């Protein structure tokens, strides 16, 4: 009975499309036509962090806005102090192909994972002064792609087996499973309230998930290729995505549509990472052509460029007080940028 | 300076174990192994000797090699392959006996022309020669109806047939080899090459072959730096 169900799916999709098109009375770029442009954004490098021997592949800031963690493919996880450039910690991993790391919002734990299908959790308090493995989560059936702490006892992971999972660290068992994507899941973003989270997959689609219920509420389409990055707008009512089709897009939750597109004719490379600024006015993106671009998010106009890396730019981040930007790339260096 | 001169001193003890660890890792060469189900990859692994990856180690003339194998992954390779862009070499095992040679060739082409894999070399093991030698002598001409141009092919001059070996198996072997060399010598750059070998089922000399191919790879890279090649 495939024909009837396919026809019903087509009819439901048509109804959804009509109900969406009935709402788009105006466009964002028309309502923001009497707004002064931001101008020209010049930013300069203040620090350069050295010590890794292979490509750096992920980073993450702490909530005190001074310490950060980074992961490399030589099997090392380094914890850095950014005001001084002193190395606070260096942890040797059991496996070389790490692809993600996270730093607890309390400052006591770290986590990592990769091509070994495991999530490893390390305790930093270390009464005896030695960092040792505290936990290993061993349930996914494909490589680990991302992970983010909710608190000291719960964690959310996405895997390259088209699934997401919510884990309880204390007993080491899964608590919730989120299924419904049909391709590898690449990124996830926690909301400011952490009652919801968004996810993007290698099927040109994003979804919104409820943590407590375990169900999918909304699906967002509009890109043309695999989605590599995703993040929330500062107030949790919108988010932004970047794909292999060399375009960024802004999606809205309450209107359930797309609002703005960021692209140019001279850009023919994919996008690796995205982030917002503290006020939400600028959007920063990293590319495969070794550079980073700063966009005016309210008007879809380029406002600046950062160019300091000799290889592919793999990660990007902004602090909670908004005073610095950190970029890492495949040339084994981390750079901190600030505005004069 | 009680707060300082102790965090500055601790950061210097960490930085010497980082340099000491990287010293042992500069004498080791890492390989990536690819095959399929029909290809005798397991026998090759055993002769050289539910997790994501397996590792094996061997040592030749006081040099160390690490070889990595992919375990519990899904069918789609286009994302986790990018992790292997700085290995010394890729070993490709092909069962030379559904048209499976066509899809093996397609995978070879996708690997060859991919960005972030354009500077890595390939060692090709054409496995299961006795099966071909038995099959082509019993009137099973799958090459003739899966590859029409085999009707218009003759043995090359640089062929070195083994003694007591029929011409027909020789033509089959060199046709299948030239199929890969046509892709290899088409869209290169001068920055990576291909090293083909004929392998039996269970053999005892593949270790020397890996040793020699890696040595030639590094010598050619160096000679390209000095503008002498």
């Amino acid at each position, epitope marked *: 009975e495939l024909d009837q169900l396919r026809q019903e799916a087509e009819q439901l999709k048509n109804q959804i499309r009509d109900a969406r098109k009935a709402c788009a009375d105006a466009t964002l770029s028309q309502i923001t036509n009497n707004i002064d442009p931001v101008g020209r954004i010049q930013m300069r490098t203040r620090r350069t962090l050295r010590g890794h021997l292979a490509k750096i592949y992920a980073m993450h800031w702490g909530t005190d806005s001074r310490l950060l963690v980074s992961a490399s493919q030589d099997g090392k996880l380094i914890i850095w102090d950014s005001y001084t450039t002193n190395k606070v910690h260096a942890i040797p991993l059991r496996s070389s192909w790490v692809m993600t790391c996270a730093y607890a919002p309390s400052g006591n734990y770290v986590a990592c994972g990769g091509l070994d299908n495991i999530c490893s959790i390390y305790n930093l308090k270390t009464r005896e002064g030695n960092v040792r493995v505290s936990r290993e989560l061993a349930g996914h059936t494909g490589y680990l792609s991302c992970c983010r702490f909710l608190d000291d006892n719960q964690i959310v992971t996405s895997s390259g087996d088209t699934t997401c999972a919510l884990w309880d660290i204390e007993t080491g068992q899964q608590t919730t499973t989120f299924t419904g994507h049909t391709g590898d899941v690449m990124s996830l973003s926690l909301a400011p309230d952490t009652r919801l989270f968004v996810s993007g997959a290698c099927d040109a689609s994003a979804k919104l998930w409820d943590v407590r219920e375990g169900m999918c509420r909304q699906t967002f389409t509009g890109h043309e290729s695999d989605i590599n990055a995703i993040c929330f707008f500062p107030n949790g009512n919108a988010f932004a995505t970047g794909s292999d089709d060399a375009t960024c897009r802004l999606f809205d939750l309450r209107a359930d549509q797309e609002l703005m597109t960021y692209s140019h004719d001279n850009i*023919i490379c*994919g996008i690796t990472s995205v982030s917002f600024s503290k006020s939400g006015r600028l959007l920063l993106a990293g590319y495969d052509d070794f550079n980073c671009n700063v966009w005016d998010a309210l008007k879809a106009d380029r406002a600046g460029v950062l160019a300091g890396h000799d290889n592919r730019v793999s990660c990007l981040g902004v602090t909670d007080d908004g005073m610095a930007v950190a970029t890492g790339s495949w040339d084994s260096f981390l750079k901190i940028w600030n505005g004069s | 300076s009680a707060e300082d001169k102790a965090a500055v001193e601790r950061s210097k003890m960490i930085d010497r174990n980082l340099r000491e660890d990287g010293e042992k890792a500069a004498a080791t060469h890492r390989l990536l192994l690819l095959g399929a189900g029909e290809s005798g990859k397991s026998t090759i692994v055993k002769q050289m000797r539910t997790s994501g990856i397996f590792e094996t180690k061997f040592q030749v003339d006081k040099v160390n090699f690490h070889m990595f194998d992919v375990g519990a992954q899904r069918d789609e390779r286009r994302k986790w392959i990018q992790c292997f862009n700085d290995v010394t070499a890729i070993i490709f095992v092909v069962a030379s006996s559904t048209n499976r040679l066509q899809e093996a060739l397609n995978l070879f082409k996708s690997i060859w022309n991919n960005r972030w894999l354009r500077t890595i070399s390939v060692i090709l093991f054409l496995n299961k020669q006795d099966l071909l030698a038995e099959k082509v002598l019993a009137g099973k001409s799958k090459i003739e109806d899966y*590859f029409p141009e085999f009707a218009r092919y003759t043995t090359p001059e640089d062929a070195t047939p083994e003694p007591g070996e029929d011409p027909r198996v020789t033509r089959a072997k060199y046709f299948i080899r030239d199929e890969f060399l046509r892709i290899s010598t088409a869209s290169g750059d001068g920055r990576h090459y291909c090293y083909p070998h004929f392998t039996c089922s269970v053999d005892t000399e593949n270790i020397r072959r890996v040793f020699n191919d890696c040595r030639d790879i590094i010598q050619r890279m160096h000679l390209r730096q000095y503008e002498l090649l």
Partner: nanobody, 128 residues
């Protein structure tokens, strides 16, 4: 919303001919590379042919070479396969597939594991 819909197919006799069409929507058609794959009863997926962005490079598999002809129309966003002198071994479902990324010279698009950018397919039966 990437969409691809196939048309054609049906039941024919040995020595016959057919013309399969593939209409695409949801992307910039001329930036990508296209190809034709097929699946026979009791087997896996097999790659049949491919054509590039402009149409100056065309590739066929060994068994169908000389009998099939692929073409593309960039103004109307259409892909065509013209099949001549059919045989009973050509009874299968046929799919129209797209490569993952634009401006790119390689593709990984034959997997059974629900490749996302191909269509539902059309059936071709050859019998007396």
């Amino acid at each position: 919303q990437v969409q691809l819909q196939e048309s054609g197919g049906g039941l024919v006799q040995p020595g016959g001919s057919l013309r399969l069409s593939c209409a695409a929507s949801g992307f910039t058609f001329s930036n990508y590379k296209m190809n034709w794959v097929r699946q026979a009863p009791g087997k896996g997926l097999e790659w049949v042919s491919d054509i590039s962005q402009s149409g100056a490079s065309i590739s066929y598999t060994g068994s169908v070479k000389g009998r099939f002809t692929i073409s593309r129309d960039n103004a109307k966003n259409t892909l065509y396969l013209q099949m001549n002198s059919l045989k009973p071994e050509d009874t299968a479902v046929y799919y129209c597939a797209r490569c993952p990324a634009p401006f790119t010279r390689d593709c990984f698009d034959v997997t059974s594991t629900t490749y996302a950018y191909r269509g539902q397919g059309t059936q071709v039966t050859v019998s007396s």
